[PDB]
C-alpha cells in the first residue's frame, strides 16, 4: 500500500562532483501535484513550476510521467553514501506516498 | 476501452443498508482513484468521495462521512460503496466515475437505489 | 462549502446558433498547486452523465471543436458554436479543487425547431 520508488543501487559520482540517476515510481498517473524530496533539496512539479529545485541550488530535476531524471552537484567526498528518493503526490486527494531503498552515491 | 459495470436496482426497506459495486474493465483497477457520484431524482448531481484502489485511502464529503462507506476490492477490480441507515431521501441513483486527468471521467451505467416500505 | 450557480436554469438555442452557459463559484476555484479545476458535465437525456471540459478551457478526447471553456475565478463560461440536434441535454460545471467538490444546479439546452 504505497507506490514503487525505485532508485539506482550504487552511484558514481562525476569529476566536478555531480551524481545523476533516475527516480521512477509506479502509480504515476496523479501528475499534477509532486513534491519530490532528497534525503541522505526538496521542490514540488506541478504546472506553474517545471524545472525544480530553484530554491536548492546544488540540485537539478526533469520530470517525465514514471521517470525522475535527478541531479545532486557540488557533491564533496564528505558526503558520500545513502541517498533517499521521496515521491509525493498531493494531488488528487488523498496523499499516495512513496520512499526508495536509497541510493549509495560514492563520490570518487 | 473501459467499462464500468454497477449492480442493478435495488429495493431496500428503511432502515437497512445497502453495498453496490463497480467491476471495472479495459484498464488496471488499481491505477486510477474512483469517486461515488449521487443523483437524486431533483436532477442535480453530489459527490460522495474518492478511493486509491491500490491502497484503500479515501477522501470523504463530510456530509457523507456517516452514510456512505466507499471500499475496493484489487482481485475483483470492483469497487464498493455501503449505506448505512436508508432513508426515504437515501433513495436516488448512484454512480461511480473514474479519474483520467479529471474528475468523472469515465462513468458507470448507475444504481438506482428506491429505498421503500 | 463553495457553491455553483448556474444561469440560465432553461436555454432554448436553435440549431447552428451559439449557446452558451455562465457558472459563478462562491469563492475563487483556483486551486493551491496554480491549476484552476473547472470541469463541465453534459448529461444527454437517460444517460450517465459524459465530460466535456476539464481544468477551465481543456476538451477532454471525443468531445468536438464546437464546445469552449473561459474563465477565472469566481467566473466561468461554457459555450457551444453552432448547436446541433445531437447537443440537447443538461449541462453541469463542477470544481474539484476544494473539498467537498461540488456541482452546478445545471442548465437544460432545449432546441428550437
Known amino acids: 500500500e504505497a507506490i514503487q520508488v525505485t532508485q539506482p543501487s550504487v552511484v558514481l559520482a562525476s569529476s566536478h562532483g555531480v551524481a545523476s540517476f533516475p527516480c521512477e515510481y509506479s502509480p504515476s498517473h496523479n501528475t499534477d501535484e509532486v513534491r519530490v524530496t532528497v534525503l541522505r533539496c526538496a521542490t514540488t512539479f506541478t504546472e506553474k513550476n517545471t524545472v525544480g529545485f530553484l530554491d536548492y541550488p546544488f540540485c537539478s530535476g526533469t520530470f517525465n510521467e514514471s521517470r525522475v531524471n535527478l541531479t545532486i552537484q557540488g557533491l564533496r567526498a564528505v558526503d558520500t553514501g545513502l541517498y533517499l528518493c521521496k515521491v509525493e503526490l498531493m494531488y488528487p486527494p488523498p496523499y499516495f506516498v512513496g520512499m526508495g531503498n536509497g541510493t549509495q552515491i560514492y563520490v570518487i | 476501452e473501459v467499462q464500468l459495470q454497477q449492480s442493478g436496482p435495488v429495493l431496500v426497506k428503511p432502515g437497512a443498508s445497502v453495498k453496490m459495486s463497480c467491476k471495472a474493465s479495459?484498464?488496471?483497477?488499481?491505477?486510477?482513484?474512483m469517486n461515488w457520484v449521487k443523483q437524486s431524482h431533483g436532477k442535480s448531481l453530489e459527490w460522495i468521495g474518492v478511493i486509491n484502489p491500490y491502497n484503500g485511502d479515501t477522501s470523504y464529503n463530510q456530509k457523507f462521512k456517516g452514510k456512505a462507506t466507499l471500499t475496493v476490492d484489487k482481485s475483483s477490480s470492483t469497487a464498493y460503496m455501503e449505506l448505512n441507515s436508508l432513508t426515504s431521501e437515501d433513495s436516488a441513483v448512484y454512480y461511480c466515475?473514474?479519474?483520467?486527468?479529471?474528475?468523472?471521467?469515465?462513468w458507470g451505467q448507475g444504481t438506482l437505489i428506491t429505498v421503500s416500505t | 462549502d463553495v457553491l455553483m450557480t448556474q444561469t440560465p436554469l432553461s436555454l432554448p438555442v436553435s440549431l447552428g446558433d451559439q449557446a452558451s452557459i455562465s457558472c459563478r463559484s462562491s469563492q475563487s476555484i483556483v486551486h493551491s498547486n496554480g491549476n484552476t479545476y473547472l470541469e463541465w458535465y453534459l448529461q444527454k437525456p437517460g444517460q450517465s452523465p459524459k465530460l466535456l471540459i476539464y481544468?477551465?478551457?481543456n476538451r477532454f478526447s471525443g468531445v468536438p471543436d464546437r464546445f469552449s471553456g473561459s474563465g477565472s475565478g469566481t467566473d466561468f463560461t461554457l459555450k457551444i458554436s453552432r448547436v446541433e440536434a445531437e447537443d440537447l441535454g443538461v449541462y453541469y460545471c463542477f470544481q474539484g479543487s476544494h473539498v467537498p467538490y461540488t456541482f452546478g444546479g445545471g442548465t437544460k439546452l432545449e432546441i428550437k425547431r
Open positions: 479495459g484498464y488496471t483497477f488499481t491505477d486510477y482513484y
Open positions: 481544468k477551465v478551457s
Open positions: 466515475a473514474r479519474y483520467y486527468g479529471s474528475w468523472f471521467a469515465y
